[PDB]
Amino acid sequence: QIDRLITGRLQSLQTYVTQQLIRAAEIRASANLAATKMSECVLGQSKRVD
Amino acid sequence: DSTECSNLLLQYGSFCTQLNRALTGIAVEQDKNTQEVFAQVKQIYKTPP
Secondary structure, eight states: OOHHHHHHHHHHHHHHHHHHHHHHHHHHHHHHHHHHHHIISEEEEOOOOO | OOOOOHHHHTTTTTHHHHHHHHHHHHHHHHHHHHHHTTTTOHHHHHHHH
16 A cells, blocks of 8 residues: 555656756756847847847 | 546546646647747738739
């Protein structure tokens, strides 16, 4: 009976870790875009449209 | 088309709702990307004859 709970909670932890990794990848892409926009628009004048 | 299967699945947790939310987010972000790519100007122009 304990093995089923252990397996379920381990699978839940693995799913949470996978979701957090995907969300961290999205946040990394957003942060790279934000750093590029900072270095371009703030520390200079950009000629890129939109 | 089963009843006992659903009764046994309801004891696992919120996996069903989690997968549903993930698929809904995917479906929403697809349209978000489609609008961000094409719908860039809020004015439909037409070529002269």
